Structure 1
Amino acid sequence: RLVKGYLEISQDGYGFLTENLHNLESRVAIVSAGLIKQYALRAGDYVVGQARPPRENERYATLLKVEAVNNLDPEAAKNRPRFDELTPQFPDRQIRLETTPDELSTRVIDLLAPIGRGQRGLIVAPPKAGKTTLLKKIANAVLKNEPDIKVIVLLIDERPEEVTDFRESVQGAEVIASTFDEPPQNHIRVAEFVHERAKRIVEEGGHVMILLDSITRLARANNLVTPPTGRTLSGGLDSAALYFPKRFLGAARNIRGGGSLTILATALVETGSRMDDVIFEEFKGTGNMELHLSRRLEERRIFPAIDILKSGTRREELLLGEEVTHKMWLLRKVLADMDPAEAMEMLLARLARTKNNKEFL
């Protein structure tokens, strides 16, 4: 028999499991140490095993046996590469980008910031400047382009109506949310839970993509959670308290042996408080691709309102041929003189004629 959950190991070798609500609910389950030792798995796995109801003198269910682990033979689970020891590479198994629901705006997305397997991406915009629905569109496209990829969406510190909008509009993909109604400890719990789950899932050589609403909101939430860390960075920020979100985003990587972990998250800047500017800068050095969204292009209601000059990716050539290298080099040389708004509208007119590759052809 297999009850299933996300293992959270307690100090004493036994652990706990949560339910499908992806929040601590009364349906938690307890996990014994002996079986995990028997199969010697790594923390945060999608654990399954046989269990027995709460015994007399026992207030909660307890583990009796295990039959199959992580949907695989437990013996095979005994030997596997460790996630943190996987040889990282640059994204070399690119996800070819072609999505129907909006071929033009999605053309802008593809042509300005490519997305590949294991991309450590980050999108940075001021408040109320085009984030959540953009993430929604990206998720919807991915759920059609690569049905094999396990796509997970995480929402921290956001409005409930957006949560329900996604849950209805995601068409069955794992949508996890934690509205601002919950105390920040709930945010941290859910975030780290999904972090470990994704890590252990990717460790199996799989391709995982996490779309994180409100990452700089999550950073402010850490600051609230941030108990001291010591010295105050400029703007009320903590020095090392960004270490946990730093590792969270740094998980995004390409692995040369198969599988990948790509995180795209929404960051806030120009909020009038140095805290957010410093947070964004601290993340900018850790992500491998950044998407600046210019507040003025949004004020002009040009979507996507991307600050093309400031925006850019790292190692396009590994995702883009020398031919695309040269054509985009020419585009940079030329559009440097074209204004962002006029450039955007010009590109809109041109690409409405043909697909990205058809435009290249």
Structure 2
Amino acid sequence: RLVKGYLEISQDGYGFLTENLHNLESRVAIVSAGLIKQYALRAGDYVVGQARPPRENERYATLLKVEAVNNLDPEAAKNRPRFDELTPQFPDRQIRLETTPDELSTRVIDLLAPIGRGQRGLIVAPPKAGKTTLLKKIANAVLKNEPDIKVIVLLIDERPEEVTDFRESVQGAEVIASTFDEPPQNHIRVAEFVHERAKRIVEEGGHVMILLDSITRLARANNLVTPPTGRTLSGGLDSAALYFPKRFLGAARNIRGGGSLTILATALVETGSRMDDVIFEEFKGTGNMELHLSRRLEERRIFPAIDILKSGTRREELLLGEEVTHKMWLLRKVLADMDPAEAMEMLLARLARTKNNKEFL
């Protein structure tokens, strides 16, 4: 009998193998501390191996033998550089975005905020400004442009119907979700488990993206889980609560030893709460990509409702050739002077004609 799951090490030195729901489950498989010390396993490690039905007085099946860890043999798990010891650098290898049902949006992203592997990216928008739909487009474009990469879709504190839509529209990539019906604790647990799994995979030189809707809601859960910290930050935030979201987001990085973690998360702003704006500003100093969407641009029903001027990346020279870089510089010079809605409509009109390379020509 074979079982599979993701390793979750308990305080007692023994661990459990989890299912996709990322929670304690009756079918979780026991893993003794002995096996953990044997295979140098770590939280988030994907473990597959023969297991047996629990003996009398055993409530959970036990892993009889370890066969594969993160889809590979356990040996390499003993001798491998630790994720925290991997060198973090800039994303030096870009990804071109294209999704058939909306190529306008993917091309506009390509021209505004090119994506590389190891990206720490963020999209900032008021409610109802193309955020969730845009993230769907990016997921689809990745699953057409970067099939090799372990694409992970994480949905925190968000809408159940959106979970269903993305589950169905992600064509099989790992969609993990925890709706607003769930308490913050479930959100934090699932998010951290997914995070640890991603870091374990990237440890193996693997390429991962985490598409995190509502990183702000994750920060809210982090705040509410922070038990005192003493003083409260202005706007209702806690001083030490944001350390966990900050580390969470800053884990994404380019590795000079292979593989990387690219996290694209969604930020809410202009919500009338100092809390949201403070979270936005705090994460901006950690991220290498910001893409702004304007509420007014939505209100006119012109899409994708992107705020061109505010959007951009850092170190585009590392993801673009000089021709593309100077093209982008020319375009931004042309667009800097003129209004958001007008700018976006005009750009859509120009880009509707041809694919980006021809609109260049």
TM-score normalised by length of structure 2: 0.95
Give the distance between the partners of 2:57 and 2:285, measured in 1 at CA.
Answer: 54
* Greater alpha carbon shift after TM alignment, 171-180 vs 292-301: 292-301
* Greater alpha carbon shift after TM alignment, 270-279 vs 88-97: 88-97
Which secondary structure state, in structure 2, belongs to the residue aligned with residue 65 of structure 1? coil
Deviations 1:71-96 (A, max 9, x none): 32222221111111111221112113
Which secondary structure state, in structure 1, belongs to the residue aligned with residue 75 of structure 2? helix
Deviations 1:276-325 (A, max 9, x none): 11111111101111112222212222222222111111000111222222
Whether the 8 Å CA contact 2:9–2:42 is kept in 1: the answer is no
Residue in structure 1 matched with residue 355 of structure 2 by the alignment: 355
Whether the 8 Å CA contact 1:231–1:238 is kept in 2: the answer is yes
Query: How far is the alpha carbon of 1:154 from its aligned partner?
Result: 0.7
Which of the pair is proportionally richer in strand? 2
Which secondary structure state, in structure 2, belongs to the residue aligned with residue 307 of structure 1? strand
Give the distance between the partners of 1:335 and 1:2, measured in 2 at CA.
Answer: 59
> Percent sequence identity over matched residues?
100
Distance change (3 Å), C-alpha of 1:280 and 1:253: same
Give the distance between the partners of 1:131 and 1:357, measured in 2 at CA.
Answer: 26
Whether the 8 Å CA contact 1:2–1:67 is kept in 2: the answer is no
- Written as runs of structure 1 = structure 2, the 5 A alignment for 1:12-161 is 12-161=12-161
Whether the 8 Å CA contact 2:124–2:291 is kept in 1: the answer is yes
* Greater alpha carbon shift after TM alignment, 160-169 vs 55-64: 55-64
* Greater alpha carbon shift after TM alignment, 65-74 vs 298-307: 65-74
Distance change (3 Å), C-alpha of 1:68 and 1:195: closer
* Greater alpha carbon shift after TM alignment, 162-171 vs 192-201: 162-171
Aligned residue pairs: how many? 361
Whether the 8 Å CA contact 2:215–2:266 is kept in 1: the answer is yes
Whether the 8 Å CA contact 1:2–1:66 is kept in 2: the answer is no
Query: How far is the alpha carbon of 1:201 from its aligned partner?
Result: 0.7
Whether the 8 Å CA contact 2:93–2:318 is kept in 1: the answer is no
Give the distance between the partners of 2:105 and 2:61, measured in 1 at CA.
Answer: 51
Query: How far is the alpha carbon of 1:165 from its aligned partner?
Result: 1.4
Distance change (3 Å), C-alpha of 1:77 and 1:309: same
Whether the 8 Å CA contact 1:44–1:197 is kept in 2: the answer is yes
* Residue 329, structure 1, aligned to residue 329, structure 2: yes
Whether the 8 Å CA contact 1:297–1:305 is kept in 2: the answer is yes
Query: How far is the alpha carbon of 1:210 from its aligned partner?
Result: 0.8
Deviations 1:231-289 (A, max 9, x none): 21111101121111111111111112221111111111111111111111111101111
* Greater alpha carbon shift after TM alignment, 317-326 vs 274-283: 317-326
Query: How far is the alpha carbon of 1:26 from its aligned partner?
Result: 2.7
TM-score normalised by length of structure 1: 0.95
Which secondary structure state, in structure 2, belongs to the residue aligned with residue 290 of structure 1? strand
Whether the 8 Å CA contact 2:122–2:266 is kept in 1: the answer is yes
Whether the 8 Å CA contact 1:101–1:141 is kept in 2: the answer is no
Query: How far is the alpha carbon of 1:125 from its aligned partner?
Result: 1.0
Query: How far is the alpha carbon of 1:110 from its aligned partner?
Result: 1.3
Residue in structure 1 matched with residue 196 of structure 2 by the alignment: 196
Distance change (3 Å), C-alpha of 1:360 and 1:17: same
Deviations 1:299-357 (A, max 9, x none): 22222222211111100011122222222222222212221222212111211222111
User: Deviating runs (4+, > 4 A) in structure 1?
Assistant: none
Query: How far is the alpha carbon of 1:191 from its aligned partner?
Result: 0.5
* Greater alpha carbon shift after TM alignment, 80-89 vs 318-327: 318-327
Deviations 1:48-99 (A, max 9, x none): 2333322223222223332343332222221111111111221112113333
Give the distance between the partners of 1:353 and 1:20, measured in 2 at CA.
Answer: 43
Query: How far is the alpha carbon of 1:2 from its aligned partner?
Result: 4.2
Query: How far is the alpha carbon of 1:228 from its aligned partner?
Result: 1.7
In structure 2, list runs of 5 or more residues that go unmatched: none
* Greater alpha carbon shift after TM alignment, 283-292 vs 294-303: 294-303
Query: How far is the alpha carbon of 1:222 from its aligned partner?
Result: 2.0
How well do the aligned residues superpose, as a CA RMSD in angstroms? 1.6
Give the distance between the partners of 2:215 and 2:78, measured in 1 at CA.
Answer: 35
* Greater alpha carbon shift after TM alignment, 208-217 vs 331-340: 331-340
In structure 1, list runs of 5 or more residues that go unmatched: none
Distance change (3 Å), C-alpha of 1:73 and 1:28: closer
Query: How far is the alpha carbon of 1:100 from its aligned partner?
Result: 2.5
Give the distance between the partners of 2:68 and 2:143, measured in 1 at CA.
Answer: 29
Which secondary structure state, in structure 1, belongs to the residue aligned with residue 309 of structure 2? coil
